[PDB]
Design a protein around this ligand. Structure first.
Ligand SMILES: Nc1ncnc2c1ncn2[C@@H]1O[C@H](CSCC[C@H](N)C(=O)O)[C@@H](O)[C@H]1O
Ligand SMILES: Nc1ncnc2c1ncn2[C@@H]1O[C@H](CSCC[C@H](N)C(=O)O)[C@@H](O)[C@H]1O
Lengths: 194, 194
């Protein structure tokens, strides 16, 4: 009921928002989120919308407390529990309650393009052991940006899924040592060395 | 356009279907799916709906070929690429094309209840090395049914998320050796032994 905010996913592609997400959004008094998240959810031009610049603890704490006086909704791109706010949330002394509303992630869109099951991979957010180890039992699905060190991947065949569902969507294939990254919205698929 | 079927997710909870899923569904000439998947998507009483009993290769091959003459849609519970048809699809000599439309999985709903990121776990579909190995770098999120051998898990603390978003939804906590499973819709959360 009260003394709590919602963190809702905006989805990845247009028309991926859920009936529950819209209801939560429709009721909110103030909506926080990055411009992409707001745009995606179709509320970047709403008057209740505040575009977030930062996403650190301090900034989420502010939003958090304001949620005691008013109904707050935070929109995250894609799915909230995929390379989302989880981590910093654990660092916040929880007075107000927080509830998560799932949405479709770039991870799901990529898996759908590849015809690969989630139980066949390990989702990585952008280690040493995360290479040989995980690759021993799983393909890797890495959420990367243009600064991902491909080095750290050898001569392995990789599939780059760029800007899924965006104007410049591209799927490329090649070897980590001879392919260049160019988009900050890049999912890197690495088949398990079986 | 043609010579291809869609496999769409019905979601997990009511109101989790996407605008694209509905459009695909609204256009379909024949709809296949298990009763839960059809019920969830709100089409179990549609005249175009055929409730699936089996989900083996032979049965999907049939549906597949019928998709050459008519517009076919197959609805999977939750998300299609989570413990879905991926595996048997790889065993089918692909004439007709298949496209996947993502939906919200029980995996996402569980992660949202736990406030845990997908990049922090390994999703398991119901091994020896899948225990100590994966648990060395990830929590485990196991999609289980009432026959999951808890043995195969020791004295580890586990969290059981049962019937998420269903009448009998329950979240229980305990040790694998002293807790009993009772639902075929059970997600088993095992924190990484860190
Ligand atoms: N449209 C897109 N196409 C490809 N990758 C994307 C993407 N959107 C996000 N990503 C990946 O996701 C990363 C951001 S972390 C945010 C992910 C989001 N919450 C979700 O569930 O999708 C990016 O660095 C990129 O690797
Ligand atoms: N409502 C629910 N609550 C808890 N677990 C569920 C569930 N629905 C499905 N499951 C899990 O999913 C398994 C079926 S495999 C099908 C999963 C579905 N495609 C999805 O994306 O959710 C069950 O054995 C159970 O472990």
């Amino acid at each position: 009921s009260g003394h709590m905010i919602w963190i809702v996913g905006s989805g990845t592609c247009r028309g991926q928002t859920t009936e529950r997400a819209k209801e939560i959004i429709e009721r909110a008094e103030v909506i926080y989120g990055s411009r992409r998240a707001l745009e995606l959810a179709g509320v970047v031009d709403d008057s209740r919308a505040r575009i977030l610049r930062s996403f650190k603890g301090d900034e989420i704490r502010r939003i958090m407390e304001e949620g005691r006086e008013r109904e707050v909704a935070v929109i995250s791109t894609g799915d909230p529990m995929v390379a989302g706010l989880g981590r910093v949330l654990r660092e916040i002394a929880e007075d107000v309650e927080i509830k998560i509303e799932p949405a479709i992630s770039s991870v799901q869109v990529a898996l759908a393009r590849l015809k690969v099951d989630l139980s066949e991979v390990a989702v990585v957010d952008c280690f040493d052991a995360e290479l040989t180890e995980l690759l021993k039992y799983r393909h890797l699905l890495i959420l990367a940006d243009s600064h991902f060190p491909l080095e750290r991947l050898g001569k392995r065949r990789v599939v780059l899924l760029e800007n899924l569902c965006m104007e410049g969507e591209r799927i490329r294939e090649g070897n980590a040592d001879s392919i260049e990254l160019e988009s900050d919205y890049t999912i890197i698929f690495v088949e398990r060395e079986v």
